[PDB]
């Protein structure tokens, strides 16, 4: 099976990528999230995520692609309001999202 996993990218001075359950229930609007779908890697950043989280999200996505997929996977960047169909096919319709936490 193609992998399905979700990483919460959160922090500021120290930013960490933590694996969380694949669900909208794991999302908030203050962090970035990487939905790894194997051949496609979705890099989603909340409207209130900060620059350190966004930069860490880009590093994590390229890391998965180059170092775990032999460079052979697409990274797709989306924001709130531009989520692609395949993301919604996996997670279901987008609900309201809570604010992030410090």
């Amino acid at each position, epitope marked *: 099976v193609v992998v399905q996993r979700l990483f919460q990218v959160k922090g500021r001075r120290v930013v960490r990528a933590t694996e969380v359950p694949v669900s909208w229930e794991s999302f908030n609007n203050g962090n970035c999230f990487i939905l790894d779908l194997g051949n496609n890697i979705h890099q989603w950043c909340g409207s209130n995520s900060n620059r350190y989280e966004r930069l860490k999200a880009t590093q994590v996505s390229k890391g998965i692609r180059d170092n775990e997929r032999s460079g052979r996977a697409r990274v*797709h960047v*989306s924001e709130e309001g531009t989520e692609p169909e395949a993301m919604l096919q996996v997670l279901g319709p987008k609900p309201a999202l809570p604010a992030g936490t410090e």
Partner: nanobody
Amino acid sequence: VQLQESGGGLVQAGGSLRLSCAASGRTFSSFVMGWFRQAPGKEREFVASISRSGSVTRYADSAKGRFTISKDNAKNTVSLQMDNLNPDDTAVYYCAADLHRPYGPGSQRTDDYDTWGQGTQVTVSS
């Protein structure tokens, strides 16, 4: 989620055809769509693509100046108007969807398209 094409058939050289593809089923949003063609005995090759909103289009070399891709976002349909056909345009024509791409028109690479219709046959006589 579900793609079904229509409008192919047999046409004289120089003639026109209008293919259409219906998007049905569970759709949550708009998505990239494109048209490919498989000549008798060959592989699938890019013809044209169009972005989620229909605002941007992209065309293969052979399609420039002859074909027009469009979409009706209300009906969830995309069309390929093919004008001034010639015999080597004979192929099965497939509408495909790139559900992962968040913006822009489709790429020209078959492997970027994950959802496919069943295809409509197009024969150009001589």
